[PDB]
Amino acid sequence: XNXXX
Amino acid sequence: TANRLESVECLTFDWISRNLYWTDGGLKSVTVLRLADKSRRQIISNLNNPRSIVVHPTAGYMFLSDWFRPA
């Protein structure tokens, strides 16, 4: 996914 | 700044006007703040997954990207 965390 | 931040995914600086702009992934907004006095307002309010922001001080434009499904 493109989640920063 | 440390009041009301939830995920500050990017910063950028309008060096001519002395304004710092940032994007928040949890509030889902763009905030701007000035460094001469700590004045701040959410200038854009209802994004989805906003990420990068950039500001062109001379042209007066700002650009930001939302990566939600209709990106």
Side-chain angles (χ1 to χ4, degrees), chain B residues 26-41:
Chain B
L27 301 181
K28 301 188 181 304
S29 57
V30 171
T31 302
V32 68
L33 165 146
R34 174 159 154 275
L35 300 188
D37 53 63
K38 309 310 181 185
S39 40
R40 63 182 274 187
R41 177 171 286 283

Side-chain angles (χ1 to χ4, degrees), chain B residues 47-61:
Chain B
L47 304 182
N48 288 291
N49 297 334
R51 186 153 285 159
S52 286
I53 180 158
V54 72
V55 165
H56 192 163
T58 56
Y61 289 126

Side-chain angles (χ1 to χ4, degrees), chain B residues 3-69:
Chain B
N3 176 2
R4 286 175 184 79
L5 298 175
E6 301 295 340
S7 55
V8 185
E9 290 198 45
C10 187
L11 303 181
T12 196
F13 194 56
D14 172 359
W15 62 89
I16 307 186
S17 321
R18 307 294 293 165
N19 308 160
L20 188 74
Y21 290 81
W22 70 81
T23 293
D24 185 300
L27 301 181
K28 301 188 181 304
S29 57
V30 171
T31 302
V32 68
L33 165 146
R34 174 159 154 275
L35 300 188
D37 53 63
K38 309 310 181 185
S39 40
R40 63 182 274 187
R41 177 171 286 283
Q42 287 195 11
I43 55 167
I44 312 298
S45 309
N46 290 106
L47 304 182
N48 288 291
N49 297 334
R51 186 153 285 159
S52 286
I53 180 158
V54 72
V55 165
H56 192 163
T58 56
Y61 289 126
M62 71 168 187
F63 309 81
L64 61 143
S65 308
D66 188 2
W67 64 261
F68 196 63
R69 193 267 149 258

